[PDB]
Amino acid sequence: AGSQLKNLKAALKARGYDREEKKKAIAEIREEFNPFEIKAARNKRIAVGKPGISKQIGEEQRKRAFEARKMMKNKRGGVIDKR
């Protein structure tokens, strides 16, 4: 049907010296008109995943794990916190 550009101009005419309304409206139209960072399946009788956010957290997790192992790698001491 109608274009994403036409719907985007309609969404901007919809949303229209306050700041937080513009922060909210801009974040809303960005996460609405960005469809390639969700994943949608087809219901055989729909947003089923958030690929980039899941990827970002899965790789930041192992990034801090890798830096922790690189910090541990040639240590021999350690504080023993019994508190």
């Binding site: 010296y17 306050d18 700041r19 937080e20």
Partner: protein, 825 residues
Amino acid sequence: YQRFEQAAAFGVIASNANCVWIPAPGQLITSALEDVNIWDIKTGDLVSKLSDGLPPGASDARGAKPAECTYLEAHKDTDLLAVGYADGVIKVWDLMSKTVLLNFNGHKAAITLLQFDGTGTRLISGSKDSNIIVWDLVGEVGLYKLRSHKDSITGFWCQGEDWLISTSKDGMIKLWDLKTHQCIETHIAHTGECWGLAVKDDLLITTGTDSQVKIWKLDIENDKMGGKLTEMGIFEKQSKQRGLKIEFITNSSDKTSFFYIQNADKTIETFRIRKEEEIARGLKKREKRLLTEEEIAKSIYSSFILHPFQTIRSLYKIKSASWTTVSSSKLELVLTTSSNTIEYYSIPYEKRDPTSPAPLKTHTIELQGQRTDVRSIDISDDNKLLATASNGSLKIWNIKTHKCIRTFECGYALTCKFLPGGLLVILGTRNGELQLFDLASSSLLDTIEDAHDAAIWSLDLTSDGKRLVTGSADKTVKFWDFKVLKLHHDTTLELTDDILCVRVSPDDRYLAISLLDNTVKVFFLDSMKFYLSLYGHKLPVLSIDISFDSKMIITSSADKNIKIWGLDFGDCHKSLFAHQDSIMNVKFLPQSHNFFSCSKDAVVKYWDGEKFECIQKLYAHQSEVWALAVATDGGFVVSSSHDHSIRIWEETSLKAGERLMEALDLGIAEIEGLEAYNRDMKLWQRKKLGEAPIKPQGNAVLIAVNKTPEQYIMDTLLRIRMSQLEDALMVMPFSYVLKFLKFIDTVMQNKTLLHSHLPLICKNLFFIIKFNHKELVSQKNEELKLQINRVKTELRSALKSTEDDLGFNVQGLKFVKQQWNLRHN
């Protein structure tokens, strides 16, 4: 959020509009800003303030200035008020129930006159855009729009249904035939503008820019083009300014007529027009010395038929007037002046002498106003209110009744404050003077002459009130104590520059002073220590405010933005740009970090000090908001402005081819219906006249567009385009081709629209029969055969008739050129 709203507005009695008078002297309807208030001249109490049912500041109030009322007008007998506003709308109210009956937007700019006509049911309206519209009240409809003036309607005069006559802000007076709504006769009245119009039936009177008042004779039953309205002579006035309202009366009990010309400044020139007996018995006296010269003298009439009268003056500049009369010794004239005040004068006249060297006002309603803009507003704990003016009119209004109960005379006073026990007012004036007043006793406790060398600009009490600070344009601030109830100057801090705002903290801690040199300085009161210098505002800087915790200050200026400063280190937080003219004042709430700022562009604005949003954008004033004051506890805020207003704020689709086909079918159906009607008429006129057909009523769309069917088909045949014309003619079948031939056969009898559409008729007809030639020559009907012969004869006669003069003009023009050549090549 617990938002704000407007509780009540007051302080205005007469605003930028006219006034209508109602008989019982009598009462008076006049304008406050955007709402109309009725007053009884006898006592002067505000008996009605007819206002819009929606409070300005509510949820559905729209984001602009409210429409200022600009013309009052009243229907007396059927009891209506037609009022008109500055956007162009006209609200008609019944004065019994005070609701809005009629809304009549219509115009595009502010409106300048109303008039009821034929006393009820018709209202004519002239506006600052040059249209003048007639409205019916039984149909709620703009009937007619008289549209030929060029600048702005300054006056008109109508009689019912036939003649209107208007004059506008160009030099032009116009007379309008209201049957055809075309302008009939136009003159240039005055060489600049034309501001006045009045007429008692024979003579018409107009005035323009400067003192030249022109008498005209309108002869309504004239027949010549120029001469329905002729000019009969000019005269002079005493005012060299714009006379801008003229109005007539016929006093009874002999019969006599009086008219006034109000002026721009301060003065109404009244005139008695005389009667025909003294016209006849005064003609000979200037016809003395006995005739070409005497005829020139008799032609050069105004001073003859018009007689000046008692020139009524006033204290202030005059905005509007209207009168009443009895006995010719009670010319009783109400007058609304610009500095808000109405005045009821009355001149007597013993029918030969006006019995006074100068007329006398019998009433004056001026108590609920100020005569100037309120340069400083203040409030009590919660009960009373303080308004400070330039004439001297300090006034102590009260919140719970909106009435000034106490008023004094100070001078050009720009700042004031209360005293912390109540019932006591400190004030500073624009010269080197300070003054003290109270509430129970009379005006002056004491004044201090030479309180400062130059203009004082801002003072502030301490929170206990015993010690106040005055900063003035003599580049000094001074401190004063209260000794026992008198003022004790003890110390004075001279700066390098003109201090123009002071403030202390609400806990006796800081003294923040705003200099003319684009900065503020924060001092310690206990040391004169020079704590901080806040800098970077980039124009001279107006009102400061310190928060309740004494941590956060605001800083307003003429840079159209307010800056938030943290007072612990003097570090800026925001620099938020409000208010596109100039923020005059800015004030916190009592207990919160929310604040208000009123500005020089007719708007107050509600902000928070944490997210720095704009909480609300309040839009009730009309002009420069000079001051605002917040309640000490609770937090309702008053704001007072340049439009003499003081207001409270509290909490809450076919195509070508088928278009031509349906046009052809209805057109030829009408055509042969009328031809059958004509055959019926000839048979019932050639036979026994006992019967005939009843009536073919003409077609709905044909009488709706006012066209003969040949013209209707001709313009839709025009309105198809040349690219799809050969398709529009190819789509239609042969029955529509036959009725197209009937259409062409009828249209080349009306030889007017044959000759104006010859190549179109030729192109369409020749394509039609060229495309349908195989079927056309197989039709067997002598009616169509005679039809084709008739179309052929008339069409070829028209075409040879136009190429005859084409060939004539070719040979004649080349003869002209050739005889010029053989003359002088």
